[PDB]
């Protein structure tokens, strides 16, 4: 298991070179798959060149993290933060956080990010320890701690679940790393190490209590937590296309289908990426929804990377809904699929879009995953539309998310066909295109329509 350390999903060009060459030439399917937490990963590396992508990556400042031991994952950052200029200070702190956590074995993998609100792209409620960023006059003050988010549950094992993450409290920036730490150790030592299924943060607040664990995580970290500082989310997608930076900057985002960057016919986008990285001042940036900012363009430099990225097919124009949908890797490389995800999301789309066109609501989106078995790598577990591998060809169906990932989606129909789901969309969608209120999103819909039950306590009513 490859996973590349990429906090925040900052990458140099000279980094993005190396990591290109060696896709090209020492991988058999010669891409660069963006992950949906900011980093990349190679496939079909082969055993004579194992030891040469190591020293690949430490060629150019990149290291990967010993999966046999160390159960932390990469730290994930707000990647284009609407107020541009908390960016830096924010990121500074993805990576004192990822630096602090790197090798006390933990009994299950351990997920962490860095969010600032309003934009949740990094899906918090994924993951199990969350870090929201609050400001005054553009300099970080301290961070609302959110703890116990996770996804992953097991076809008819209702010991299993998906969970949102609690809020703890607020604390000043200085007691973040004792806050971390605290944490991370209090999971180390009350979780559940002997059942690997329960032994993930999710079930140790449920076991114990978040008010018990929450008081302990005081108690080592010789802080009080304060009452949370408002925040609020607006959404989860990425902002595709130019939007302006600090200073005279500006940042490009490119939406790539799957994350999966390779040349295709009349789509040269691996190629088109290198030629970018060549002529880029700055740095890229890899989102969390497995898309590209080419971050920090001069104004004077951006019709030249335009050029270049019209050109390759990155800027190649899709619908809202396409870019407001991910699936996870699955086959032909996943061992554990149940079912296609990214090889199927495309032509999937494409009916979702006839759907959508021909409900007239063309110009909104469904925040919509498919995730190719339960561990829920795909997220389809915070989704308004999740789609969940059963069996080749099938899935579960879940709706009743919302638009910013704070509630799961409860389950609406089990181990269905593409056709049947389509069918059972075309009928929903025409719904809510008649019904909604304004700005109503499709998952709050089918919740107020009675179409699905809320999932409003997952430990307890998950699962009917
Ligand atoms: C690439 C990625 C999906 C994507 O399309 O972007 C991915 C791919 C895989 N994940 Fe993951 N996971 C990815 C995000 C996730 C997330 C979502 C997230 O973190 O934001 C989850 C759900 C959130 C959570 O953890 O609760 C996730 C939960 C899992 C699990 C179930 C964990 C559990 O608690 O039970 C497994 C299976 C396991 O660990 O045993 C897993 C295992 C895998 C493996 C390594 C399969 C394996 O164990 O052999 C996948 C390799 C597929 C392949 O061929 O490349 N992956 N995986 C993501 C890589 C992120 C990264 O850079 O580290
Ligand atoms: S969700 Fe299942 S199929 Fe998809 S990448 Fe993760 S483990 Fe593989
Ligand atoms: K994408």
Same mark, same amino acid.
């Given at each position: 298991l490859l996973r590349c350390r990429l906090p925040g999903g900052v990458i140099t060009t000279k980094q993005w070179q190396a990591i290109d060459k060696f896709a090209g030439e020492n991988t058999i399917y010669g891409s660069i798959r963006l992950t949906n937490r900011q980093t990349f990963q190679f496939h079909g590396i082969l055993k004579k060149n194992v030891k040469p992508v190591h020293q690949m990556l430490h060629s150019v400042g990149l290291d990967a993290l010993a999966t046999a031991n160390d159960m932390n994952r990469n730290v994930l950052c707000t990647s284009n933060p609407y107020e541009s200029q908390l960016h830096a200070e924010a990121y500074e702190w993805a990576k004192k956080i990822s630096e602090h956590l790197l090798p006390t074995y933990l009994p299950r993998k351990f997920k962490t990010t860095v969010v600032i609100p309003p934009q949740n792209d990094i899906d918090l409620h994924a993951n199990d320890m969350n870090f929201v960023a609050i400001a005054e006059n553009g300099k970080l003050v301290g961070f609302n701690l959110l703890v116990g988010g996770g996804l992953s549950i097991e076809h008819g094992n209702k010991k299993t679940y998906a969970r949102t993450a609690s809020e703890f409290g607020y604390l000043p920036l200085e007691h973040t790393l004792a806050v971390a730490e605290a944490v991370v150790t209090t999971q180390r030592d009350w979780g559940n190490r002997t059942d690997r299924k329960n032994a993930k943060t999710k079930y140790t607040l449920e076991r114990v209590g978040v008010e018990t664990f929450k008081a302990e995580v005081e108690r080592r970290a010789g802080i009080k937590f304060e009452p949370?500082? =408002?925040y609020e989310f607006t959404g989860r997608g990425d902002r595709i296309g130019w939007v302006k930076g600090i200073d005279d900057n500006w940042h490009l985002t490119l939406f790539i289908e799957n994350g999966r960057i390779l040349d295709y016919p009349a789509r040269p986008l691996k190629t088109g990426l290198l030629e970018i990285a060549k002529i880029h001042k700055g740095d890229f940036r890899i989102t969390?929804?497995?898309?590209?900012?080419?971050?920090?363009?001069?104004?004077?430099?951006?019709?030249?990377?335009?050029?270049i990225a019209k050109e390759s097919g990155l800027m190649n124009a899709v619908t =809202?809904?396409?870019e407001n949908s991910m699936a996870c890797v699955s086959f032909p490389t996943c061992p554990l699929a149940a079912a296609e995800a990214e090889r199927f999301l495309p032509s999937f789309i494409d009916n979702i879009d006839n759907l959508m066109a021909k409900?007239?609501?063309?110009?909104?989106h469904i925040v919509m995953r498919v995730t190719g078995c339960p561990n829920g790598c795909g997220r389809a577990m915070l989704a308004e539309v999740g789609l969940v591998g059963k069996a080749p060809g099938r899935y579960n169906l879940h709706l009743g998310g919302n638009r910013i990932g704070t509630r799961i989606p409860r389950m609406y129909k089990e181990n269905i066909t593409e056709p049947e789901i389509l069918a059972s969309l075309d009928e929903l969608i025409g719904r809510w295109a008649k019904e909604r209120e304004a700005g109503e999103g499709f998952g709050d819909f089918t919740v107020r329509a009675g179409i699905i039950r809320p999932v409003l306590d997952p430990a307890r009513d998950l699962w009917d």
């Open positions: 949370i500082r =408002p969390a929804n497995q898309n590209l900012i080419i971050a920090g363009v001069p104004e004077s430099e951006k019709a030249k990377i335009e050029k =809202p809904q396409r409900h007239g609501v063309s110009d909104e």
